[PDB]
Amino acid sequence: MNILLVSQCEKRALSETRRILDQFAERRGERTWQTPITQAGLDTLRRLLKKSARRNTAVACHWIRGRDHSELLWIVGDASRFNAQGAVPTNRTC
Amino acid sequence: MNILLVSQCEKRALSETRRILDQFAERRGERTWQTPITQAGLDTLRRLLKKSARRNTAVACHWIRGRDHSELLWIVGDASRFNAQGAVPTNRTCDWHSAEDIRLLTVMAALFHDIGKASQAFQAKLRNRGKPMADAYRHEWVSLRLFEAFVGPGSSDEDWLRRLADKRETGDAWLSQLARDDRQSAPPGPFQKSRLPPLAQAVGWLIVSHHRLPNGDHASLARLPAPIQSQWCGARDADAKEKAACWQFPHGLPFASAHWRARTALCAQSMLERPGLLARGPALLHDSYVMHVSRLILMLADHHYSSLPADSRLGDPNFPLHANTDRDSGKLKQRLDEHLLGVALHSRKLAGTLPRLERQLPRLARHKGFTRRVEQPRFRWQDKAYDCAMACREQAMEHGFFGLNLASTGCGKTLANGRILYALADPQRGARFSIALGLRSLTLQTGQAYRERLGLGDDDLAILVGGSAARELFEKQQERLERSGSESAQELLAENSHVHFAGTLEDGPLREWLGRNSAGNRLLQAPILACTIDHLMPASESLRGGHQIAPLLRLMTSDLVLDEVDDFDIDDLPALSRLVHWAGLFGSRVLLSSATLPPALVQGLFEAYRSGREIFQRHRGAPGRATEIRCAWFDEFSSQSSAHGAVTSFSEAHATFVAQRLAKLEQLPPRRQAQLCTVHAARPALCRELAGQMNTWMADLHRCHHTEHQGRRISFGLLRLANIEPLIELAQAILAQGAPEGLHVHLCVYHSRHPLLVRSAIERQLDELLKRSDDDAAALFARPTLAKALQASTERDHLFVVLASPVAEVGRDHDYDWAIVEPSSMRSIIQLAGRIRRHRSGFSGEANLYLLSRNIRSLEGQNPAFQRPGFETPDFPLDSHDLHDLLDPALLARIDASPRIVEPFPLFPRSRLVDLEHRRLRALMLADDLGVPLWWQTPASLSGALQTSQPFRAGAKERCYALLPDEDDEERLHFSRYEEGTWSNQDNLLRNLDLTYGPRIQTWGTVNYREELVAMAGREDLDLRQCAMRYGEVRLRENTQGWSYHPYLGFKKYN
Amino acid sequence: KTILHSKRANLYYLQHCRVLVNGGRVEYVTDEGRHSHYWNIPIANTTSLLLGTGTSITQAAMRELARAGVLVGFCGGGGTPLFSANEVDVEVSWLTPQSEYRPTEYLQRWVGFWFDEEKRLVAARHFQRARLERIRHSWLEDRVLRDAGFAVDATALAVAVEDSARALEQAPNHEHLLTEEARLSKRLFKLAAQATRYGEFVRAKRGSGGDPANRFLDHGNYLAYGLAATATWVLGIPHGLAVLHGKTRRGGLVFDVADLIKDSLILPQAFLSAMRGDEEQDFRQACLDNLSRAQALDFMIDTLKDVAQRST
Amino acid sequence: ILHSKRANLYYLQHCRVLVNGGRVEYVTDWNIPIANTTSLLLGTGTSITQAAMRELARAGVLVGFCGGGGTPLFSANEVDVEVSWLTPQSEYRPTEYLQRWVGFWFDEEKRLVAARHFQRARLERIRHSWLEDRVLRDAGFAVDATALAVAVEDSARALEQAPNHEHLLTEEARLSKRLFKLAAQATRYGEFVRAKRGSGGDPANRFLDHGNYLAYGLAATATWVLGIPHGLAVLHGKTRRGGLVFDVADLIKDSLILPQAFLSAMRGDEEQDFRQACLDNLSRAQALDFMIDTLKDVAQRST
C-alpha cells in the first residue's frame, strides 16, 4: 500500500518523530513523508511511534482506498490537531 | 483522481501559492494539500499556478497510479527543489570562457558610446524647441572621432589604456589632436592603417554601430573594418557652418566629471590587469561571436536606459551637458554623464545575467505526448526518429546538430519534429525550441493547428501572429526619436505584432530590460515558439534599429525548426543561409523540415552551420573539441545519424540516404496520376475561356473520382493559380458562368489578400471540412455544413471546389479528390499532388491531377513565363514554356519527392524544369560556374554590405491596410491605411465589386467580416476597433487608382 | 527496530551521489552546482541498494546499512554489467551483511544436496516448474495486468507454455534446460510485443538496445537481481551455490532465483511502461509496485524453501 | 596493515579508495599487491567508489567493511566455491574448504572429532597464554600457576573421552567456570559471578561482553576469509544461529579476553582503553591467523 505520513508534532516530540519516520519513509514536504509499505511494516511503524510518544506527538497516516478517496488509517498522539478526515486548521486562536 | 500538492515556495511566492491552493484543496500539513479532482480541474489549477509564478514558486503534484506507486504529475516553478521522484532534501548546504572580455568591451564602449553628444550643434538641437534641423554628422561618428582623439594615432594598445587608467589626468590637450571630417583634405578613416590600435578598433566599431550598422559602398569586404569612411555612417549635405558646429565643444566633453573618469580608469585598469587581454586584439576584432554578443548587450542596455526617468543619484548634479529630452514635454531629461554611467552599469548587469539564461528561462519538461509510443503502423517512423535522436542526445549536446526531416507530405512531420527536438534535450531540465514556418504571414489558425498537433496549450506554446514589416516609419518616427535625443527608444519588436502567450511572465530573468507584458518578454519566456522565418531574419538582417535583439536572444536560448524551408524564393536563399550560420554561431541546433530539399541547398546550409559552430565551440564549452557536426537524417522509412567535419563526407552520407529513400519510394503503390491539359490561347477573355474549359474538366474529374452515398455524389476539388489578380478574374469568370450541367458547384476563394481574421476563418472551415479517411462516407454526409448544402439542393451531384493561391501549399492538411494546377515549379506540383487523397488509401487508376500545358503568364506572352513564383530568369532562360517538353513523361505515372531530392546528371538547365531549378540552386548556394560563403569567410558581418547586396524580400513595397470600423458608428466601415502609428482614412480608394451568379452555383467556406470581427474581439476580450487594427491587416502594393473589394473575393486591384 | 526483511517494500537505485552518515542518518548527497542536497534513505524499509555510475560509500554509512540487513551492490550504469571478464559479465558486486546471523536449517539442506549433480539438476527442473507456473498465473489468471493494457493471446501463450513444459520434462542435462529457457524467453518477448501493440521487437544483448523496451528490460534485471540476492541472504544460502546458472555467472543462485519473476512481472511491465512514455524512474516504481503487489520476495523465499525441503 | 599474512588480508584506515588513471590509489588525507589474493578490509574513515570496486572486482580482490581495528566485520564480499561442478569464470580464487567441511560435517563421529580438536586447541591456548607467556602476568596478572595447570590437566582428561556433544559442552562449561574463579583469585578482584545475557554492571562483566563481541567479529572475519558459512557449527547445536562463529571465537575467548578484562577492571580504565588493549593483545598473538590455521588443520586432518 501507499501511505502518507503527516506530522504536527512540536518541541521535543518533533525530533523523535523525524528520527523515527526518516527510517521508514521518504520526505515529501517539511513535515510530510510517503512510502510504499506492507501491513506488517505499517503495524511495526505504528507501534514504534506509539512506544516513544510524548504529549506533543501528532502523526497521521493516510491511505488511498479507491481513486479520489483518501482514508485516514490512524493517528498517533494528540488527535485534536486533525479533524475527522485528517486535515489541519489554517489558524488556531484562543 | 486523488492528487497531493506539495509546496516548496518561499518569500513572496509562498503567499500566492497558499492563496491559489487554498481554493482548490484542503490542507494536510504545513505546506501540503490534497483533494479529489478531475482532469479538467487539474489542468485549470496547473494553468492558474503557472500564470502567477515567480522565481521562488515550487509546487509538485503527485498521483496514485497502482497501489504503493505514486507518480509525479508535474512541477510548477523551480524544479530543482525536488528530485526525479518528487522528494525533498533533508538539508541543503553551499562555462563561458569569454564572458569577462565581452563584459569589459561592452562597459568601455558604453562609457564612450555617447561621448559625441557634447557637441554644440547637438546641444542646440536638443534645446531647439522650434523647427527641427537635421544634424550634419551622426553622434556615433563624432563619438568615434573623439575616441580616436583620446587614444591618439599610432598609439600602442597599452599606452592609451594606462593613460586612461591614471585618474590624475586632466590633459584636455588631446582634443587638439582630434581630426574633423568637416575640415578639408579628407582625413583618413579611423580604421585605416594604424589610426587605431587593434582593440581600440573593436571599441570604435562598438561605438559607431550602437544605433545602425556601418553600411557603405564597394577585397574591400575582407579588409573590414578598415575601409569604413565618414560617408559610410550617415552624414548629410549641409553648409560649412552646420558641419563645423558638430565639432566645437563649448561646455567640454564629459571628462571633467569625477565619476565618469573614475569609472573609465577602473575599467582601463581592469582591462590591463587581465592576463593576455591585449594579445587577442586582432582575434577579438574579427570574432563574430564576441562582437555581436557585445553589441547586443550594449544596444539592449542603451535601449533600457534611454527610457528611464532622470536620476540625481549618479553623475555630476550640475553637469552642463545633456543626453536626451522627454518626448512628453521636450524638457531636458538626462545629463550625459548620468546616461553614460547608467548604460555602462546596465551593460555590466546584462553581461552578468546572460550566462544564467540557460537555467533561469522557462522550459518544457516531463511532457508525455512526446515520449508516448504510437499504436498505429502508419505513424511508426515517429518512434524511429525519436530513438535516433535519443541515441545522439549526448554527442549532439557536445558537438552540435544539423537534422534533415525528409519525410513525405501527409506523414505527420510536425509531431516528428517536436519529438526529435524534445529527445535532443536533457530530460532533467526540459526542451526549448522554435518552429519557424516558411510563410510570409502566420495566421492564428496555423498556430492553433501547431498547438493541436503537438498537443500543447497556450501555457507552453506561444504564437507570434502576423508577419514581419519592412521599415516604413524609418523616415517619420525616426525624426521625432532623434529630436528627443533618444534614438534607441523604438520598441525592440514591431508594434502591430502580438505574441499569443499565457504563461510565466512574472519574474523572468530579462524582465528589467525587455518589460513585463512586452512582446519581447513573451517571445523569450515561451518554452516553444511558433513564428515565421521572416520573424527570425531580423536577427541577422537588421541594419537600422534594435530589431535584432529579441530574435537573437531567442536564437541563443532555443533550438530551431525550419518548416517548409525550401518554400523561400531563390533570391531570399542567402538570407536564410545567414540565419542558419548565426543559429550555429550562438549554439542553437537547427532541424530542417521539408520533403523536397535539393542537395545543393542542404550542402550550403550545412556548411554555414558548421562554420558557425566552429566559432561557437571556440568560445563556449570544453576547449579543444573537434568540429564534428552530429548530422542526422529522418524519413518515413528509417532514421540514420553520423558525425561529419567537412562537406565532403556529409554530401556522401546525404547521397547514400537519398538513394536508399528513393529505392524504398519506387516500390510504393501509386496514389496520384497526372495528366497534361492543353489550353487554347486579355484578362476578361482569357479568364472566361479558362472558366469555360474548367467546367468540362471539373465534370470529367468529378465523374472519375467522387464519393457515393444514398445516390448522392460529392467530390472535393482544388484549383491553384500562380497569381492573385488572375485568380480573382477566373473566380469571377467561373461565378458568372454557372454549373456545367446539372452539377451543382460550391466555390471557395482562398488567397492571401483577405483580412487576416477572414483568412483564418476560411482556413478554419477548410481544415474542418477537408479532413477525410478511408470509408468515411457515412460521417462525411452527416457533417452539418455539408448536410445543409446537400439537402437544400435537389441535384444528386455536388462539386465542392476550392480556388486557392500558392498559400495553400504550406500548412494546409487537406484531402482533395482531384486538382487542376497551373505550373509554377516542380516543388509546387509535388506539394499539391501530396494533397489529393493524402489521408485515404486505394487508387482507381484514373487521372486525378490535371496540369495545364502552360501557365497564364505564358498565355499573356510575358517572358520569362516561370517567375514570381518560379525560377526562370533572363540569365537562366528556358527554351520552351509548354509542359509537354519541360517534364519527363515517366513522371506523370508517379509524382513524389524523387525528382527534387536527387540531382539528375547530366544537367540540361534550359530544357527541363527540375534541371533548371537544380542548376540555379547549385549556382547560387555552392558556387558552380558576391558569394554566400563571404558571410563567414570574410569579416563582412561587421558591416551591412551583404544585407544590401543580397536583400531579403526585396522588390515590392507593400503598405498595411485594414477595414477599420468608424469610431462613432460601429456599423460603418472605413478603408484605412497604417502610415506612421496612425490609421489614416482612405475611403476614396475603395469601391464595391458586383458579382453575377450563374445557374446552380453558390459559395461555400466564406465568412462575414463583421460577424468574424465581433466574434474574435469577444474571444480576445479586446475593443472592436483595437481588434480590427491588430488582426485585420491586408498588405497591398501601392496603386494610384485603388482597389475593388468584395467579401467573397478579397481586394482586387482596380485600374 | 526495523521491518522483517521479507516485508520491506522499498528498493533504491542510486547514481552520481555520495552515500554517507549525516547526523546519525544514512543519506546520499547530490551536487546541484552551487549547493549540496542531502536525501534520506529509509533503511528500515529498504531491501537493498544499487550504486550505479559515479556513486561512493563510506565506512560509517556501510556500517549503518549492515545493521538493518540492507544489502549493497555496485551495479553499472545504463543497464551495463560492472565489467566483462572476457566472455562472461558480472553485473552486481554484492556486499552481504556479516554481523547478522542467519537461520541454519535451509543452509544445511542446501549444502547437503548441492554436491550431487543429479540432485542439483532435479533442483533446476523444480525451479523451472515454478517459473512456468508463475508466468501462466501473472500473464493469464490475473486482472491487474489486463486492466493496464496487457492483452495477451491466451491460446498462443498456453501452447508456448505447454511446449516449454514438455521440453522441460524430457530435459537430459543443463544445456538443454538453458536452451529451452532461452527459447521460452524469446517467444515471450514476441508475445509481449504483440500484446501491447509495441511493433517489432528484437532483443539486444549487453545493454546495446536503443528502444525503450530493451533499456527497461536491462534495468529491471537489476531489480530482479536485488530481490533474489535479498531472498538468498535471508534464507542463509550463499550466492555461489547455484543450480542452473553456475557455469558462466559468479554468484549464480541470485540469477536462478531472479529468473522466477524476471519473465512474469518484469517483462509485461517493461512494454507497458514503454508504451506509456515512461522514464526509467517511473518504470522502476511501476516494477516495484508489481513486485510488492504480487509478493515476489515471498514467492522467492517459499520456492527456495520448497526446493530445499524436497531435496531431502 | 597486514592483519593476517597467512591469508593475504590488508586493513585500510582513514583513506579514500578511488581510481585515477586506471589504477586504484588510496589517497589518504600505498603499494598493494593487487591480485587474486589481496582481500582488503576497509576500516574507520574509509570511503570507496564504484570505479574502485570495479577495478577491485576484475582482480579477484574481495572487499569487506570491518569496524575499528579489524572487528567487527559489518559486511563483506561473498566467497565463491571451487567445486568442479560450477565453472566461475573470473579473476577470483574460489576456495575449496567448504567442500571438505560439508564432507565431514554431516557424520556425527567426525563432527565430534573436530569438536574435540577445537577443545584441545582451546586448552593449549589457555596453557600457553597463561603460563608460557608471562607478559600478561608481568603486566599485573600474577596467577596461581600450579592451580591453572591442574585445572587445564583436568579439562584435558575430561575432553579426551566421554563422547556425545552435550558432554563436551558440559566439560567446556566446567572448565570456564573454574577458569573464571582462578582468574578472579589471580587478579584478587574478589568474588565474581558472570551475569548471563550481558546484564551485569560490574566492570568485569561488561569488559567480558565487549571482549566477546570483539572475538565474535574476529571469528566472522576468519570464516569469511576461509569461506565456510556460519551455520555449519562443530561445537554448538545445529539450531544455534551463527554456531561456527562462536566455536571459532571460543579458541581466543578465554585465553586473551578474560585476563585483559580483569586487568582493565583492576586498573579502572575506560571502555575505549580496554578495547584498545584487547585489540593490541589480539594483534600480538596473531589471533586471526591462529583461527584460520586451526580451521584449515581441522578440515585437512579429517579427510
PDB file of N, CA, C and O in Angstrom, chain B residues 262-300:
ATOM      1  N   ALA B 262      36.571  58.350 -13.076  1.00  0.00           N
ATOM      2  CA  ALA B 262      36.898  57.286 -12.133  1.00  0.00           C
ATOM      3  C   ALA B 262      36.473  55.927 -12.675  1.00  0.00           C
ATOM      4  O   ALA B 262      37.232  54.953 -12.611  1.00  0.00           O
ATOM      5  N   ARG B 263      35.258  55.845 -13.222  1.00  0.00           N
ATOM      6  CA  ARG B 263      34.791  54.586 -13.793  1.00  0.00           C
ATOM      7  C   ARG B 263      35.614  54.195 -15.013  1.00  0.00           C
ATOM      8  O   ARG B 263      35.929  53.015 -15.207  1.00  0.00           O
ATOM      9  N   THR B 264      35.972  55.174 -15.848  1.00  0.00           N
ATOM     10  CA  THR B 264      36.810  54.889 -17.008  1.00  0.00           C
ATOM     11  C   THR B 264      38.165  54.339 -16.577  1.00  0.00           C
ATOM     12  O   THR B 264      38.667  53.366 -17.150  1.00  0.00           O
ATOM     13  N   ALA B 265      38.766  54.951 -15.555  1.00  0.00           N
ATOM     14  CA  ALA B 265      40.055  54.488 -15.056  1.00  0.00           C
ATOM     15  C   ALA B 265      39.942  53.089 -14.467  1.00  0.00           C
ATOM     16  O   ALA B 265      40.831  52.252 -14.654  1.00  0.00           O
ATOM     17  N   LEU B 266      38.856  52.821 -13.742  1.00  0.00           N
ATOM     18  CA  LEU B 266      38.635  51.498 -13.171  1.00  0.00           C
ATOM     19  C   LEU B 266      38.533  50.447 -14.270  1.00  0.00           C
ATOM     20  O   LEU B 266      39.144  49.377 -14.173  1.00  0.00           O
ATOM     21  N   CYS B 267      37.777  50.751 -15.325  1.00  0.00           N
ATOM     22  CA  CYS B 267      37.639  49.819 -16.439  1.00  0.00           C
ATOM     23  C   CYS B 267      38.972  49.594 -17.145  1.00  0.00           C
ATOM     24  O   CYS B 267      39.318  48.460 -17.497  1.00  0.00           O
ATOM     25  N   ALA B 268      39.732  50.669 -17.366  1.00  0.00           N
ATOM     26  CA  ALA B 268      41.026  50.535 -18.027  1.00  0.00           C
ATOM     27  C   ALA B 268      41.986  49.696 -17.195  1.00  0.00           C
ATOM     28  O   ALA B 268      42.702  48.841 -17.730  1.00  0.00           O
ATOM     29  N   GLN B 269      42.012  49.924 -15.881  1.00  0.00           N
ATOM     30  CA  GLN B 269      42.880  49.140 -15.011  1.00  0.00           C
ATOM     31  C   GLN B 269      42.456  47.679 -14.984  1.00  0.00           C
ATOM     32  O   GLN B 269      43.305  46.780 -14.963  1.00  0.00           O
ATOM     33  N   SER B 270      41.145  47.420 -14.979  1.00  0.00           N
ATOM     34  CA  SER B 270      40.668  46.043 -15.024  1.00  0.00           C
ATOM     35  C   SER B 270      41.083  45.360 -16.321  1.00  0.00           C
ATOM     36  O   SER B 270      41.477  44.187 -16.316  1.00  0.00           O
ATOM     37  N   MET B 271      40.996  46.077 -17.444  1.00  0.00           N
ATOM     38  CA  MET B 271      41.435  45.515 -18.718  1.00  0.00           C
ATOM     39  C   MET B 271      42.932  45.225 -18.707  1.00  0.00           C
ATOM     40  O   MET B 271      43.378  44.182 -19.200  1.00  0.00           O
ATOM     41  N   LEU B 272      43.726  46.144 -18.153  1.00  0.00           N
ATOM     42  CA  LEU B 272      45.172  45.941 -18.121  1.00  0.00           C
ATOM     43  C   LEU B 272      45.550  44.774 -17.217  1.00  0.00           C
ATOM     44  O   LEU B 272      46.491  44.028 -17.515  1.00  0.00           O
ATOM     45  N   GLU B 273      44.833  44.603 -16.105  1.00  0.00           N
ATOM     46  CA  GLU B 273      45.145  43.534 -15.162  1.00  0.00           C
ATOM     47  C   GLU B 273      44.907  42.160 -15.781  1.00  0.00           C
ATOM     48  O   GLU B 273      45.588  41.185 -15.445  1.00  0.00           O
ATOM     49  N   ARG B 274      43.931  42.067 -16.685  1.00  0.00           N
ATOM     50  CA  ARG B 274      43.554  40.807 -17.315  1.00  0.00           C
ATOM     51  C   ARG B 274      44.734  40.199 -18.064  1.00  0.00           C
ATOM     52  O   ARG B 274      45.365  40.873 -18.887  1.00  0.00           O
ATOM     53  N   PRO B 275      45.062  38.932 -17.806  1.00  0.00           N
ATOM     54  CA  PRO B 275      46.229  38.323 -18.460  1.00  0.00           C
ATOM     55  C   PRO B 275      45.936  37.993 -19.916  1.00  0.00           C
ATOM     56  O   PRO B 275      44.980  37.279 -20.226  1.00  0.00           O
ATOM     57  N   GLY B 276      46.771  38.519 -20.810  1.00  0.00           N
ATOM     58  CA  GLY B 276      46.644  38.223 -22.222  1.00  0.00           C
ATOM     59  C   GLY B 276      45.509  38.921 -22.932  1.00  0.00           C
ATOM     60  O   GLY B 276      45.244  38.610 -24.096  1.00  0.00           O
ATOM     61  N   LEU B 277      44.827  39.855 -22.266  1.00  0.00           N
ATOM     62  CA  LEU B 277      43.696  40.536 -22.888  1.00  0.00           C
ATOM     63  C   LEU B 277      44.144  41.376 -24.077  1.00  0.00           C
ATOM     64  O   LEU B 277      43.467  41.423 -25.110  1.00  0.00           O
ATOM     65  N   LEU B 278      45.289  42.044 -23.952  1.00  0.00           N
ATOM     66  CA  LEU B 278      45.772  42.930 -25.004  1.00  0.00           C
ATOM     67  C   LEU B 278      46.481  42.150 -26.105  1.00  0.00           C
ATOM     68  O   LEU B 278      47.100  42.745 -26.993  1.00  0.00           O
ATOM     69  N   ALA B 279      46.395  40.822 -26.058  1.00  0.00           N
ATOM     70  CA  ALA B 279      47.009  39.962 -27.062  1.00  0.00           C
ATOM     71  C   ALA B 279      45.998  39.426 -28.068  1.00  0.00           C
ATOM     72  O   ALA B 279      46.341  39.195 -29.231  1.00  0.00           O
ATOM     73  N   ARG B 280      44.751  39.225 -27.642  1.00  0.00           N
ATOM     74  CA  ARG B 280      43.714  38.691 -28.517  1.00  0.00           C
ATOM     75  C   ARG B 280      43.067  39.792 -29.346  1.00  0.00           C
ATOM     76  O   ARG B 280      42.012  39.576 -29.951  1.00  0.00           O
ATOM     77  N   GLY B 281      43.686  40.972 -29.367  1.00  0.00           N
ATOM     78  CA  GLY B 281      43.150  42.131 -30.044  1.00  0.00           C
ATOM     79  C   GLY B 281      42.648  41.870 -31.450  1.00  0.00           C
ATOM     80  O   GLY B 281      41.454  42.009 -31.740  1.00  0.00           O
ATOM     81  N   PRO B 282      43.554  41.502 -32.362  1.00  0.00           N
ATOM     82  CA  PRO B 282      43.104  41.172 -33.724  1.00  0.00           C
ATOM     83  C   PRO B 282      42.135  40.005 -33.764  1.00  0.00           C
ATOM     84  O   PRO B 282      41.231  39.988 -34.608  1.00  0.00           O
ATOM     85  N   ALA B 283      42.299  39.025 -32.875  1.00  0.00           N
ATOM     86  CA  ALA B 283      41.375  37.897 -32.834  1.00  0.00           C
ATOM     87  C   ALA B 283      39.986  38.345 -32.397  1.00  0.00           C
ATOM     88  O   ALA B 283      38.976  37.969 -33.002  1.00  0.00           O
ATOM     89  N   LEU B 284      39.918  39.158 -31.341  1.00  0.00           N
ATOM     90  CA  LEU B 284      38.628  39.634 -30.852  1.00  0.00           C
ATOM     91  C   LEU B 284      37.951  40.550 -31.861  1.00  0.00           C
ATOM     92  O   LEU B 284      36.723  40.531 -31.999  1.00  0.00           O
ATOM     93  N   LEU B 285      38.734  41.365 -32.571  1.00  0.00           N
ATOM     94  CA  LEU B 285      38.147  42.313 -33.513  1.00  0.00           C
ATOM     95  C   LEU B 285      37.376  41.599 -34.616  1.00  0.00           C
ATOM     96  O   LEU B 285      36.281  42.030 -34.996  1.00  0.00           O
ATOM     97  N   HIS B 286      37.926  40.509 -35.140  1.00  0.00           N
ATOM     98  CA  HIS B 286      37.300  39.778 -36.233  1.00  0.00           C
ATOM     99  C   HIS B 286      36.428  38.625 -35.756  1.00  0.00           C
ATOM    100  O   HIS B 286      35.936  37.855 -36.587  1.00  0.00           O
ATOM    101  N   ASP B 287      36.223  38.489 -34.450  1.00  0.00           N
ATOM    102  CA  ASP B 287      35.417  37.402 -33.906  1.00  0.00           C
ATOM    103  C   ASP B 287      33.950  37.807 -33.935  1.00  0.00           C
ATOM    104  O   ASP B 287      33.534  38.706 -33.199  1.00  0.00           O
ATOM    105  N   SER B 288      33.160  37.139 -34.780  1.00  0.00           N
ATOM    106  CA  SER B 288      31.751  37.495 -34.911  1.00  0.00           C
ATOM    107  C   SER B 288      31.002  37.283 -33.602  1.00  0.00           C
ATOM    108  O   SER B 288      30.155  38.101 -33.224  1.00  0.00           O
ATOM    109  N   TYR B 289      31.305  36.195 -32.894  1.00  0.00           N
ATOM    110  CA  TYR B 289      30.606  35.898 -31.649  1.00  0.00           C
ATOM    111  C   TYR B 289      30.812  37.003 -30.622  1.00  0.00           C
ATOM    112  O   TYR B 289      29.845  37.550 -30.080  1.00  0.00           O
ATOM    113  N   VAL B 290      32.070  37.359 -30.357  1.00  0.00           N
ATOM    114  CA  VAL B 290      32.365  38.343 -29.318  1.00  0.00           C
ATOM    115  C   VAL B 290      31.756  39.692 -29.677  1.00  0.00           C
ATOM    116  O   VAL B 290      31.073  40.323 -28.860  1.00  0.00           O
ATOM    117  N   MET B 291      31.975  40.141 -30.915  1.00  0.00           N
ATOM    118  CA  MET B 291      31.469  41.443 -31.333  1.00  0.00           C
ATOM    119  C   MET B 291      29.951  41.502 -31.282  1.00  0.00           C
ATOM    120  O   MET B 291      29.380  42.488 -30.805  1.00  0.00           O
ATOM    121  N   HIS B 292      29.275  40.458 -31.757  1.00  0.00           N
ATOM    122  CA  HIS B 292      27.824  40.541 -31.843  1.00  0.00           C
ATOM    123  C   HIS B 292      27.165  40.372 -30.480  1.00  0.00           C
ATOM    124  O   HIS B 292      26.174  41.050 -30.187  1.00  0.00           O
ATOM    125  N   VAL B 293      27.711  39.513 -29.611  1.00  0.00           N
ATOM    126  CA  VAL B 293      27.209  39.458 -28.240  1.00  0.00           C
ATOM    127  C   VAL B 293      27.468  40.747 -27.480  1.00  0.00           C
ATOM    128  O   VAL B 293      26.591  41.192 -26.729  1.00  0.00           O
ATOM    129  N   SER B 294      28.627  41.379 -27.660  1.00  0.00           N
ATOM    130  CA  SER B 294      28.882  42.676 -27.048  1.00  0.00           C
ATOM    131  C   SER B 294      27.940  43.757 -27.553  1.00  0.00           C
ATOM    132  O   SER B 294      27.423  44.544 -26.753  1.00  0.00           O
ATOM    133  N   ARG B 295      27.701  43.809 -28.863  1.00  0.00           N
ATOM    134  CA  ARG B 295      26.782  44.787 -29.424  1.00  0.00           C
ATOM    135  C   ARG B 295      25.348  44.570 -28.968  1.00  0.00           C
ATOM    136  O   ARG B 295      24.645  45.554 -28.724  1.00  0.00           O
ATOM    137  N   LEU B 296      24.899  43.320 -28.843  1.00  0.00           N
ATOM    138  CA  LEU B 296      23.558  43.074 -28.327  1.00  0.00           C
ATOM    139  C   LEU B 296      23.402  43.616 -26.912  1.00  0.00           C
ATOM    140  O   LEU B 296      22.411  44.286 -26.603  1.00  0.00           O
ATOM    141  N   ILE B 297      24.377  43.340 -26.043  1.00  0.00           N
ATOM    142  CA  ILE B 297      24.312  43.829 -24.669  1.00  0.00           C
ATOM    143  C   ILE B 297      24.336  45.349 -24.640  1.00  0.00           C
ATOM    144  O   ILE B 297      23.540  45.983 -23.934  1.00  0.00           O
ATOM    145  N   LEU B 298      25.244  45.958 -25.406  1.00  0.00           N
ATOM    146  CA  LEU B 298      25.333  47.412 -25.428  1.00  0.00           C
ATOM    147  C   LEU B 298      24.027  48.039 -25.892  1.00  0.00           C
ATOM    148  O   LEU B 298      23.525  48.978 -25.263  1.00  0.00           O
ATOM    149  N   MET B 299      23.453  47.525 -26.978  1.00  0.00           N
ATOM    150  CA  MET B 299      22.231  48.091 -27.523  1.00  0.00           C
ATOM    151  C   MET B 299      21.034  47.880 -26.611  1.00  0.00           C
ATOM    152  O   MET B 299      20.216  48.793 -26.471  1.00  0.00           O
ATOM    153  N   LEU B 300      20.914  46.711 -25.978  1.00  0.00           N
ATOM    154  CA  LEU B 300      19.809  46.493 -25.051  1.00  0.00           C
ATOM    155  C   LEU B 300      19.930  47.399 -23.831  1.00  0.00           C
ATOM    156  O   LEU B 300      18.933  47.967 -23.368  1.00  0.00           O
TER     157      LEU B 300
END
